[PDB]
Structure 1
Amino acid sequence: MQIFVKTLTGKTITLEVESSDTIDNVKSKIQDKEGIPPDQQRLIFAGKQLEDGRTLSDYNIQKESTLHLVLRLRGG
């Protein structure tokens, strides 16, 4: 299983995650690849940032879900 991580700018990242994993884990991996602070990056999905430390089951996240990431730094 893997979920897509599309950035506000224009870049998607594939991250492998277990169905019974956790959103927090996803943030950690994304941070490892890009190297962006978790606080700065906003993991938006289903019209709202996913809560850290929450199993996919709750949000009922499917496979290859396109999660949006918006950087807090700069921008508006």
Structure 2
Amino acid sequence: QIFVKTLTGKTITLEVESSDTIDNVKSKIQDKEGIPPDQQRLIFAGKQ
């Protein structure tokens, strides 16, 4: 004719937010982004 009562407790979280390895950024630089319409980029030649 009796009872059992017990509560609980929690811990939410911690974070660091660590990212961006160096090998991904070196590949991130050597690319293209697009050029409007007529914004050619050119070639050039010389030094015969």
TM-score interval (norm. to shorter) = under 0.3
Higher strand share: 1
Higher helix share: 1
Shift of 1:21: 2.4
- Unmatched 5+ residue regions in structure 2? none
State the aligned residue count. Answer: 47
Superposed CA deviations along residues 3-38 of structure 1, whole A, max 9, x for unmatched, are 999999999999999732210000001011499999
- Unmatched 5+ residue regions in structure 1? 49-76
Moved more, 20-29 or 8-17: 8-17
Q: Which residue of 1 aligns with 2:39?
A: 40
Query: 1:34-73 alignment to 2 at 5 Å?
Result: none
| % identical aligned pairs | 100
SS at match of 2:36: coil
Distance in structure 2 (CA, Å) of the matches to 1:20 and 1:12: 25
Larger Rg: 2
TM-score calculated relative to the size of structure 1: 0.18
